[PDB]
Paper text:
Proliferation and transmission of these obligate endoparasites in their host organisms rely on efficient cell invasion. This active process is based on the motility of the parasite, referred to as gliding, and is empowered by an actin/myosin motor. Actin polymerization occurs between the plasma membrane (PM) and the inner membrane complex (IMC) whereas myosin A is part of the glideosome, which binds the essential light chains ELC and myosin light chain MLC1 (called myosin tail interacting protein, MTIP, in Plasmodium spp.). MLC1 (in P. falciparum: myosin A tail-interacting protein, MTIP) binds at the very C-terminus of [name], while ELC is expected to interact with the C-terminus of [name] upstream of MLC115. We demonstrate that ELCs bind to a conserved binding site on [name] to induce its α-helical secondary structure and stiffen the [name] neck.
The successful formation of trimeric assemblies of [name] with its light chain proteins allowed us to crystallize and determine the structures of the following complexes: (i) [name] MLC1/TgMyoA-C/TgELC1 complex at 2.4 Å resolution (hereafter named complex 1) and (ii) [name] MLC1/TgMyoA-C/TgELC2 complex at 2.3 Å resolution (hereafter named complex 2). TgMyoA folds into an extended α helix with a characteristic kink between residues 801–803 (angle of 139° in complex 1 and 137° in complex 2). Both TgELCs display a typical [name] fold with one N-terminal and one C-terminal lobe, with each lobe comprising two EF hands. Clear additional electron density was visible only in the first EF hand of each complex and assigned to a calcium ion coordinated in a tetragonal bipyramidal geometry. In complex 1, calcium is coordinated in a tetragonal bipyramidal geometry by the carboxyl groups of side chains D15, D17, D19, the carbonyl group of E21 and two water molecules. Complexes 1 and 2 are monomeric in solution, but while the calculated scattering data of complex 1 fit the experimental scattering data with a Χ2 = 1.26, the structure of complex 2 displays a higher Χ2 = 2.41, indicative of small structural differences in solution. The electron density in complex 2 reveals an additional α helix for this area, which is absent in complex 1, suggesting that residues 66–77 are disordered. TgMyoA residues 762–818, which constitute the lever arm, maintained a continuous α helix after energy minimization, with both TgELC1 and TgELC2 forming a small number of contacts with the TgMyoA converter domain.
Residue numbers in the entry:
A (entry chain A): 4 to 134
B (entry chain B): 77 to 213
C (entry chain C): 775 to 818
């Protein structure tokens, strides 16, 4: 199914047709979009599906998730080999992260490094995450 | 079999050339007290087409009994949207849920269901689920 | 002069929280369909 519609449906946790609060931000981030803090500031108290749909259409018209995520990774591609280290990413997720169990983070790493290399080819990974 | 002569007559009253559409199979199966899904209709269509004679209708009916139906799984389905787990969902919640997930209701189906079954804004989804499993046979 | 990891972390956390949502909702979806089938039965 389409990503935006599905993200709304997934992050509307009580099924009342409306995302509110941090969930809103999470729904946005779950599409690969990092809202600048002023955008987060300006988010309404709640969004129904038409509101979320409009917000995401307008955002995505100017913001491209996969290349932005790729640039975020290439910040930490120290070797510059199109590849960041899985260990760094794991313990940074464990350190700064707020939502996933440690088991979840390990599952994620096994996804990103499907060959036991300790290196994450982050382009391939981001493309895998964006259907 | 459940009232064999009257099932036969209802099928034939809708039948043209001894066959009825799978949509009429759905309605007839409901009147008999079965609860086929649209997935059942699709699966049956892709082996037997869109027109059933009386025998293939009987086979359809026989495969739509859904023995996995039970109260706890139905209730857990709704309780998924209940953050309090107190056992209540609002009419807004029931409507958006039922018209968004699974095989979504049309607004007309939901409005008819709500007119008959939703007495309040705070719906006990456990009792509503029990009600829905009643008369099934 | 390393940069900060919070944006990447935030986005991946949200993504995988959504994947966990999609999977538990997958567990629940067949019985929502069952509910809807019984609803339509009561509605003839
Ligand atoms: Ca909500
Ligand atoms: Cl944050």
């Amino acid at each position: 199914p389409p990503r935006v519609r599905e993200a709304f449906a997934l992050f509307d946790t009580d099924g009342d047709g409306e995302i509110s609060g941090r969930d809103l931000v999470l729904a946005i981030r779950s599409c690969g979009v990092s809202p600048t803090p002023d955008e987060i500031k300006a988010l309404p108290m709640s969004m129904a599906w038409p509101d979320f749909e409009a917000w995401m259409s307008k955002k995505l018209a100017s913001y491209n998730p996969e290349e932005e995520l790729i640039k975020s990774f290439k910040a930490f591609d120290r070797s510059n080999d199109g590849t960041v280290s899985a260990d760094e990413l794991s313990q940074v997720m464990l350190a700064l992260g707020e939502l996933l169990s440690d088991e979840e983070v390990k599952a994620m790493i096994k996804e990103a490094d499907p060959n036991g290399t300790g290196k994450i080819q982050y382009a391939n990974f981001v493309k895998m995450l964006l259907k | 079999m459940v009232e064999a002569d009257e099932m036969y007559a209802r099928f034939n009253a809708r039948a043209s050339g001894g066959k009825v559409s799978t949509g009429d199979a759905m309605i007839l199966a409901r009147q008999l007290g079965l609860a086929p899904s649209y997935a059942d209709k699709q699966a049956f269509e892709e082996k037997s087409g869109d027109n059933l004679d009386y025998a293939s209708f009987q086979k359809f009916v026989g495969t739509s009994t859904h023995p996995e139906d039970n109260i706890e799984d139905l209730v857990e389905a709704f309780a998924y949207f209940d953050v309090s787990k107190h056992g209540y969902l609002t009419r807004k919640q029931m409507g958006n849920i039922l018209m968004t997930y699974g095989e979504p209701l049309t607004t007309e189906e939901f409005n008819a269901l709500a007119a008959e079954y939703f007495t309040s804004d705070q719906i006990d989804y456990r009792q509503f689920c029990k009600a829905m499993l009643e008369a099934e046979n | 002069m390393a940069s900060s990891w919070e944006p990447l972390v935030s986005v991946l956390e949200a993504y995988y929280a959504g994947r966990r949502h999609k999977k538990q909702l997958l567990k629940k979806t067949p019985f929502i369909i069952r509910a809807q089938a019984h609803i339509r039965r009561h509605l003839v």
